[PDB]
Design an enzyme around this catalytic site. Sequence first.
Site, PDB file in Angstrom:
ATOM      1  N   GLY A  10       0.796  -1.205   0.000  1.00  0.00           N
ATOM      2  CA  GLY A  10       0.000   0.000   0.000  1.00  0.00           C
ATOM      3  C   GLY A  10       0.834   1.263   0.000  1.00  0.00           C
ATOM      4  O   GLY A  10       2.002   1.282   0.386  1.00  0.00           O
ATOM      5  N   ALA A  11       0.206   2.342  -0.459  1.00  0.00           N
ATOM      6  CA  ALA A  11       0.794   3.669  -0.378  1.00  0.00           C
ATOM      7  C   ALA A  11       0.902   4.086   1.082  1.00  0.00           C
ATOM      8  O   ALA A  11       0.065   3.724   1.913  1.00  0.00           O
ATOM      9  CB  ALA A  11      -0.038   4.685  -1.160  1.00  0.00           C
ATOM     10  N   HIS A 180     -10.197  -5.961  12.606  1.00  0.00           N
ATOM     11  CA  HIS A 180      -9.513  -5.279  13.698  1.00  0.00           C
ATOM     12  C   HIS A 180     -10.037  -5.756  15.040  1.00  0.00           C
ATOM     13  O   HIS A 180      -9.265  -5.982  15.978  1.00  0.00           O
ATOM     14  CB  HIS A 180      -9.715  -3.771  13.577  1.00  0.00           C
ATOM     15  CG  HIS A 180      -9.253  -3.200  12.277  1.00  0.00           C
ATOM     16  ND1 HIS A 180      -7.982  -3.400  11.782  1.00  0.00           N
ATOM     17  CD2 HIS A 180      -9.896  -2.434  11.365  1.00  0.00           C
ATOM     18  CE1 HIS A 180      -7.864  -2.782  10.620  1.00  0.00           C
ATOM     19  NE2 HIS A 180      -9.009  -2.185  10.346  1.00  0.00           N
ATOM     20  N   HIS A 243     -17.548  -5.293  13.024  1.00  0.00           N
ATOM     21  CA  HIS A 243     -17.064  -5.513  14.378  1.00  0.00           C
ATOM     22  C   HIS A 243     -18.126  -6.135  15.269  1.00  0.00           C
ATOM     23  O   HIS A 243     -17.871  -7.159  15.905  1.00  0.00           O
ATOM     24  CB  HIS A 243     -16.574  -4.204  15.007  1.00  0.00           C
ATOM     25  CG  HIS A 243     -15.566  -3.468  14.181  1.00  0.00           C
ATOM     26  ND1 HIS A 243     -15.669  -2.120  13.912  1.00  0.00           N
ATOM     27  CD2 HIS A 243     -14.436  -3.890  13.566  1.00  0.00           C
ATOM     28  CE1 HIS A 243     -14.643  -1.743  13.171  1.00  0.00           C
ATOM     29  NE2 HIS A 243     -13.882  -2.798  12.944  1.00  0.00           N
TER      30      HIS A 243
END
Lengths: 502, 500
Positions: A10-11, A180, A243
């Site tokens: 990724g950037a 996450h 989540h």
Amino acid sequence: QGHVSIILLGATGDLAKKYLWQGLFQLYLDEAGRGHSFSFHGAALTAPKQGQELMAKALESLSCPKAPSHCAEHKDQFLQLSQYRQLKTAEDYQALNKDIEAQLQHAGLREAGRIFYFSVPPFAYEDIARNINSSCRPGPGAWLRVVLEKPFGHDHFSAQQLATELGTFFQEEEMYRVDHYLGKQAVAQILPFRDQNRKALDGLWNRHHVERVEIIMKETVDAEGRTSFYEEYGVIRDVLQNHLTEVLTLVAMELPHNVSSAEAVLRHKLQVFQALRGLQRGSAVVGQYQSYSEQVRRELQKPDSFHSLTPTFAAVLVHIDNLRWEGVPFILMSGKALDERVGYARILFKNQACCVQSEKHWAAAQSQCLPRQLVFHIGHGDLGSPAVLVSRNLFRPSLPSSWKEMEGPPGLRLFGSPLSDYYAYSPVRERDAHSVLLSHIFHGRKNFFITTENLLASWNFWTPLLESLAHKAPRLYPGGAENGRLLDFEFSSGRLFFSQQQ
Amino acid sequence: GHVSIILLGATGDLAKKYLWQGLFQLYLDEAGHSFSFHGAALTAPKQGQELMAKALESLSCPKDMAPSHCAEHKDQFLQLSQYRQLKTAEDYQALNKDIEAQLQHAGLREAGRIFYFSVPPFAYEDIARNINSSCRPGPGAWLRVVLEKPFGHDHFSAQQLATELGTFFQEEEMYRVDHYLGKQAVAQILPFRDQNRKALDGLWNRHHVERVEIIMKETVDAEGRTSFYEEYGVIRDVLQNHLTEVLTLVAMELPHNVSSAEAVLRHKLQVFQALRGLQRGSAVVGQYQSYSEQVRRELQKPDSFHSLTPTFAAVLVHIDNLRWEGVPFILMSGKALDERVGYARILFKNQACCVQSEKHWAAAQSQCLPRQLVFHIGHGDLGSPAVLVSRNLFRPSLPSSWKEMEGPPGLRLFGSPLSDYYAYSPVRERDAHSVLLSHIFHGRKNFFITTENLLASWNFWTPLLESLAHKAPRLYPGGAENGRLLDFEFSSGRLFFSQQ
Ligand SMILES: *[C@@H]1O[C@H](CO)[C@@H](O)[C@H](O)[C@H]1NC(C)=O
């Protein structure tokens, strides 16, 4: 035993500088000196010398955990091993292949794998992956565990389309879709907590023993620095879908006989996804704070006057049509710019006793008229640390050596009850989510990740609610402590409605 | 309107313990309508005369009104009170002649006669027909007969006694009293449900009520009363007659108006016919350690005798309607326990989720605090009758006889500060027996045990009595030592002790 190469495609964005580089480092710090060689290829579209300078600044920004010899030797080895390269063109991918086999020749060992972390914005996905399939495939039996980011789509259709378009290039067994919230230390202790405490809780998980279940994530920080991510996505797809639904399917899941098994967990959580009630119009209530519309107005310039319908707080009611959760309601709510920042999975038992003794001798570990509850505290709030809170009258829980009995301030009130009443446990060492997620990617444990059957089951759950809620104007709240009881709600039958009408 | 009241139990202690005081209070409330008061006993007449003089000596009075008027009213009551000894039917004929003589003395008119029974039950028959043969009143007058609280020990004895006494007197002319039906908050459940018509009609459902508790806890063990207590038991003395009656009071569907005083009588039987049967698993039973020695001491029993009489009983009641099919009703009573409390508690299930913090929850607006509707009647930490309504529910509307209560802070009722409640309290503390005698003189019949409802309540506990006819009670040490020994839980429709 084998050289393992990790490449971050990724950037170099904000969270790329914040979380991930410290994550890889910590990943190097656990498994160093165990026969595993390493190569941390920084990859972006920036210049090679400038990328090397920026990435070396990132390596100098890392901090060792609290000996100077440890920090000096491991920072020197981390500076030695890590290397930036240009990824602008297609032949630079096989230049990376040449670099990887060259670093294998420096290591002098056999290749073990190739992790390709993705952090690119979603404007293009097929070109990078097709160049990986063209040249960056590994050698003799090495695995290729790629990792994709969080934005997966807005309905079931786009999620399915992207799942097939990315599963053309790679196998689904190789892929690692990261959550996450599955790396949080209290979420990851739900199933082991039910594992070594199934003797005194499996007789209590039933419909005739549990009053309600609430999955709560409160936030005070509004959409600051993150507005453009939010007007298309909304709080239902932001936290409830990815989540709250996973911890919801972690608490209400039939435990297999081996929780350490991989596929049994995903097949049982798919069983939970199949054995639950559908969502209707009246089962959800939404709101947006008053500063959100003008924040979207001042962040993006659009003609005339604009009012955004994006939900910022949402509460949904979920019933699970089973022999286990027929009458138990499941409340999932989350919002930002609330009066607190907290996160917990709380299951509340029902009152079933009448006490002959009055309240002058209601001991916390003896009487059954005090409330009985289990809370998985994820962090923040008044406690700060993650915690496992058991009501003392229930039983004495068993948790591993990673968690220990903590001593907080006595008299602190959680859901109207003093802390002293709870058996409270907290981890003996705090760990970040991304560090343990990258360690599980390296270890190849797929129990903490998302497969596309689970993702499409989640989208088939949540999409009718999204298309029904696509024309309802939400109720505005001022935010912070000025809300009062404007967002409070009740569940009646299988419907949700606000406490205070307006 | 001259009314002749005759007390047939003047030799008993309860006559001047409550009944003479209640009659004096009835005179003080109703002094002009003439009155006459007569007493009777199986006692020598000079000893009976000095005994009712001694009973008339111990007379209390309200403290608000002046003692100068109190003295002349007490002298008037001493003038109107008389005594007569009764042996044979000629003595009751002379009683009727003396009643007529008291008519010619003052108020030559028979408004009616009232008879109060306080004798032991085995002489209830013959004296009754001694009233029936000769002591009847005049043509336009009425006759009222009042009987005590024992009505036999099962449905068999209750049916036999009701059929034995149904020959002499009718249902319309027979009055039955229990001890705890005179309480003012007990008499306030139906007026509360009548006044809160718009507010409480949407909440008497299965959809909002979690549980209903009715508790009468005591701290005093029966020391000299255990000869009466052994053959009767805690279920028959309070659970059968008082707690059942309050239950019916709170569970009955309210009529078009309570002032009709007739639909109240028939709407109470709908609770009886819908009450499901009582099994042996619906009740828990205990006794204290000194009860076996207490029956061993005063009553002539062998040294190895261990009684099985219950002193503590908790029962589970389920009704099956479109209102309260799954809601449990827990009735509890006991002796030698910790707090001498009596109340009826209604609890609502937790329905809300509150976004704002627990430190900012108002007592009058946050639904996450418990919602309750309590009728406290006796001897708690308040010490007074009370109607407690939590402020988040609704604002209660009680009449002018009930005032808002100024409660001291630092007081915990059901785990909540009194502030949380919108508590109320009566202006005047009136005793139960006095207002029962006032209703007997008034003849309102809504506050009395009818013949149907007495037998309707006896066959509901007779299988429980026969089921627990051999179950050994739990032996608790008594007082404040029984912390968690008598705590119990309800699993579905069963009751069990928490500790083994
Ligand atoms: C890699 O992706 C290309 C994209 O067209 C595809 O043609 C090729 O079959 C893939 N290789 C595999 C699946 O081994």
